[PDB]
Amino acid sequence: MKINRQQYAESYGPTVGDQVRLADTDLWIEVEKDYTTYGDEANFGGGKVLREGMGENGTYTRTENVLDLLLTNALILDYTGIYKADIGVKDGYIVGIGKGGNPDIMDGVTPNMIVGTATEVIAAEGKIVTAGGIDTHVHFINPDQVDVALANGITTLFGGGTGPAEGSKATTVTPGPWNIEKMLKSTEGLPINVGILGKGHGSSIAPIMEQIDAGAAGLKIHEDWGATPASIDRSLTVADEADVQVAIHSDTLNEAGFLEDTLRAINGRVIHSFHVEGAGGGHAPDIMAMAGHPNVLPSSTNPTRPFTVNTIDEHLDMLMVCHHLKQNIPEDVAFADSRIRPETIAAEDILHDLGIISMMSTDALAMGRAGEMVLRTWQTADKMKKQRGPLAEEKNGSDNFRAKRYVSKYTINPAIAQGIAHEVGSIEEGKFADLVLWEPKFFGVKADRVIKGGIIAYAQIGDPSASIPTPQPVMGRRMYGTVGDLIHDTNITFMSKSSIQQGVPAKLGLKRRIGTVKNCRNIGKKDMKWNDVTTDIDINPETYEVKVDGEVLTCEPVKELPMAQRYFLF
C-alpha cells in the first residue's frame, strides 16, 4: 500500500522533503527528517490509532514511561532543526521528542513516549510548532499587554515597571526592594512567565545589589536614570557577583562620553545591548557598532523592523511627541535627526540577515509593540530574501538556514542572554513545555494554541455557547491554564540565585514555579545560535553610512509587507 505525498501531507502533515509556505511570505521551510514509522503514525478520534490495546497502552501506570500529553505529528521549527516528530510532555516539561504510541504493537516507539490511560492528546498534524517567544524588553505599563503578547506566541516577559508611572513608561525598571516585592506579588496574577529588572544606577554597590537580593532577575541601565560610566561599572560589578544579566540603553546625548567611553566602562564584561540600531535609544549616531563586539549580546526592538516607506515619518514624529520636542526649536530637530536615521535602520535589516544582531524584542508600550516581535521577525526575513536572495548556505530551494537564523532571534538567544535557557527558549527534552501551535496560513501572525507548562493557556476559539468550538466569533481567549490556582503551575517567575537562597518566594507567599537565573556572565556573541558574527562595524559620523568588511550596508524601504492587511481588521 502506498499513499501519494499530497494525500499523506493532508492526513499527517508534511514529511521529509515537503515544503510549507510561512503565512503569505515568500519563505518556504522544508522537513529535514521525520521520527515516524510510516503506517504507525499516532492520531486521535473515532476509529483512530490512540485507543486502548492499540496505539494506547492499557497496562502502564503514569510513572511507567507514560506521557501526560502527546502532540501528534508536529512540524517543529527550532534552532535545533526543522523536522517532523511527536512531542511528549510530562510534569509540565518536554520529556520526549520522537515517536509516541504503544510498544505492544507499534515499531519505533520512543521508550518514554507511551500513550497510556494518563495521556491527553493534541493533534499537531498540519501545524507548525515553535518554542514560546522570549521577550527581554518589556515595559510593565498596562496589564492588558499580556494577552497581546500571548496572541502572537510570546510566553516569557523580561523587563520592568510598576504600571503607567513615568519611570516605567520610559525604562524597563522596577526600582528598589519594595517596588520589586510589589511586582513579584502582581506577577502571581499574570498568565505568562516573568523576570523583573531593577534599576542599574548608583555609585555605591549596596543600593543596586539590594534589588537583586529582593528578587530582581537582572538590571537595566537607562540614560533617563543617568547611563554614566559609574552606573555602568557598578551594575556590571553587581551582575558579575550575582550571575544576572545587565541590559543597556546608552547615553544618546554623549553627555558623559561617546560609545568608546561606554565600552571602556563595560571593560569586556558581558552586557545585553537593547535596540542596538539606536532609534530606541543610544549614543548618537554610532551605537549600532556595539553589535560587532564579542562581549555584547545585541537585540533590536520591533518598530524599526523591517525598514518600510512609513518608518522614518512615523519614528521622527513619535520621538518629537514622546520627548515634548518642538518643530521650531533647532536643538530639538537636530536631536531627532541625530537619532532617527534611514542609514542605520536600513543596515539593521542586513545585520539581522548576516547574524550580527542576535535577538529581537518588543520595547512593549515604550517604543514598541507587545504583539509584533514574532510578526516583524518574519517580515524582516521575507524582505531580506526578496532584496538579498536565498542565503549562500541554503539548499533544495528551501529557506531553512534563514528560518533557523530568524527563529533563534526570539526563542533561544534571548533565553541564553538572560540566563534562563536551561528552562525555556527551545523545543528540547528537559525544558519547560511552553509550545505554540500555528496554522501555516497564520504562521507568525496569530497563534492557534499557546501551551504553558503543558496546559493550554491561550487559544483562538469560537462561540462558548455553540455545539462545537469553531463557530464565530473566533477570537483569542484565555484558557483553563490561566484559571484559579493553575496559573501558578503553568508559569515561571525567574529570580536571582541570592533571592531564592534568602527565601524571598516564601516571604512574599509566591506560589508560581520559581526559575533560577544562571550562567549569564560566562557567555558572549559566540554563544548566540546562528547569530554569532563579530566584526568591525564602522558608522560614518558625517553621513551615518554603515560599513562592514569595507562594504556599505544599504537597502531600500518596502511599500508593502506580508503578514499585514490580509490578516488584520484594523
Partner 1 sequence: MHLNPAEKEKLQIFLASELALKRKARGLKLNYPEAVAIITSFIMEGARDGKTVAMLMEEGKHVLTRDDVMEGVPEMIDDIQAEATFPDGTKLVTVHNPIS
Partner 2 sequence: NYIVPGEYRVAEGEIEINAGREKTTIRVSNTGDRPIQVGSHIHFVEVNKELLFDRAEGIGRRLNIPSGTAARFEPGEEMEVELTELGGNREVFGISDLTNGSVDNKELILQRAKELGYKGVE
Instruction: Give binding residues as ranges.
Output: 137, 139, 170, 220, 222, 249, 275, 363, 366
For residues 470 and 540, which CB has a smaller minimum distance to its own copies in the complex?
Answer: 470
249 near ligand OH, rule: CB under 6 A: yes
Residues 364-383 that bind ligand OH (CB under 6 A): 366-367
CB of 366 to partner 1, least distance (A): 13
Which one of residues 30, 34, 353, 363 is an interface residue with Ni ion (CB under 5 A)? Answer: 363
178 near its own copies, rule: CB under 8 A: yes
SS3 category, 398: coil
20 near partner 2, rule: CB under 8 A: yes
Residues 444-473 that bind partner 1 (CB under 8 A): 446, 460, 462-468, 470-473
Q: Contact, 235 vs 200, CB < 8 A? A: yes
By annotation, the residues acting in catalysis are 323
What string of DSSP letters covers 427-453?
--TTSB--EEEE-GGGTTTS-SEEEET
348 near its own copies, rule: CB under 8 A: no
366 near Ni ion, rule: CB under 5 A: yes
CB of 341 to partner 1, least distance (A): 18
Q: How many residues bind partner 2 (CB under 8 A)?
A: 81
Q: Contact, 355 vs 532, CB < 8 A? A: yes
Which residues fall within 8 angstroms of residue 161, CB to CB, at 6 or more apart?
138, 139, 140, 141, 167, 168, 169, 171, 172, 173, 174, 183
428 near its own copies, rule: CB under 8 A: no
Q: Which does 185 bind (CB under 5 to 8 A by kind): partner 1, ligand OH, its own copies, none?
A: its own copies
Residues 331-370 that bind ligand OH (CB under 6 A): 363, 366-367
Which residues fall within 8 angstroms of residue 61, CB to CB, at 6 or more apart?
116, 118
Q: Which does 343 bind (CB under 5 to 8 A by kind): Ni ion, ligand OH, its own copies, none?
A: none
Q: Contact, 356 vs 537, CB < 8 A? A: yes
What string of DSSP letters covers 81-134?
EEEEEEEEEETTEEEEEE--B-TTT-SS--TT-B--TT-EEEE-TT-EEEEPEE
CB of 324 to partner 2, least distance (A): 10
Which one of residues 371, 453, 481, 505 is an interface residue with partner 1 (CB under 8 A)? Answer: 371
Q: Which does 473 bind (CB under 5 to 8 A by kind): partner 1, its own copies, partner 2, none?
A: partner 1
Which one of residues 61, 203, 327, 470 is an interface residue with partner 2 (CB under 8 A)? Answer: 203
Which one of residues 1, 392, 468, 569 is an interface residue with its own copies (CB under 8 A)? Answer: 468
Q: Contact, 539 vs 546, CB < 8 A? A: yes
Question: For cell 496589564, what's the residue?
Answer: 143
Binding residue positions for substrate? 139, 170, 222, 249, 366
Question: Distance between CA atoms of 561 and 551, rounded to whole angstroms?
Answer: 27
Which one of residues 69, 70, 76, 109 is an interface residue with partner 2 (CB under 8 A)? Answer: 109
Which residues fall within 8 angstroms of residue 230, CB to CB, at 6 or more apart?
202, 203
Q: How many CB atoms lie within 10 A of CB 390?
A: 14
**Nearest Cα to Cα of residue 480 among 451, 437, 511, 514:** 451
Question: Distance between CA atoms of 487 and 188, rounded to whole angstroms?
Answer: 8
Which residues fall within 8 angstroms of residue 257, CB to CB, at 6 or more apart?
229, 251, 264, 265
**Nearest Cα to Cα of residue 171 among 269, 250, 229:** 250
CB of 363 to ligand OH, least distance (A): 5
Interface mask (CB under 5 A) for Ni ion, residues 204-243, using x and -?
Answer: ----------------------------------------
CB of 48 to partner 2, least distance (A): 4
Going by the DSSP 8-state scheme, the letter that residue 191 receives in this structure is: S
Which residues fall within 8 angstroms of residue 295, CB to CB, at 6 or more apart?
266, 268, 269, 270, 271, 524, 525
55 near partner 2, rule: CB under 8 A: yes
Q: How many residues bind partner 1 (CB under 8 A)?
A: 51
Q: Contact, 66 vs 119, CB < 8 A? A: yes
For residues 347 and 366, which CB has a smaller minimum distance to ligand OH in the complex?
Answer: 366
Question: Distance between CA atoms of 247 and 539, rounded to whole angstroms?
Answer: 22
CB of 43 to ligand OH, least distance (A): 19
90 near its own copies, rule: CB under 8 A: yes
Question: Distance between CA atoms of 491 and 308, rounded to whole angstroms?
Answer: 36
Interface mask (CB under 5 A) for Ni ion, residues 246-275, using x and -?
Answer: ---x--------------------------
CB of 307 to partner 1, least distance (A): 10
Q: Which residue stretch of 25-33, 201-209, 394-402, 497-505 sits at the interface with its own copies (rule: CB under 8 A)?
A: 201-209
CB of 275 to ligand OH, least distance (A): 6
204 near its own copies, rule: CB under 8 A: yes
In DSSP terms, 195 is beta-bridged to 158, 494
C-alpha cell at 303: 518598530
Positions in the binding site for ligand OH (CB under 6 A) = 249, 275, 280-281, 363, 366-367
Residues that bind partner 1 (CB under 8 A): 24, 144, 147-148, 151-152, 308-311, 313-314, 317-318, 321, 369, 371-372, 375-376, 379, 441-442, 446, 460, 462-468, 470-476, 558-561, 563-570
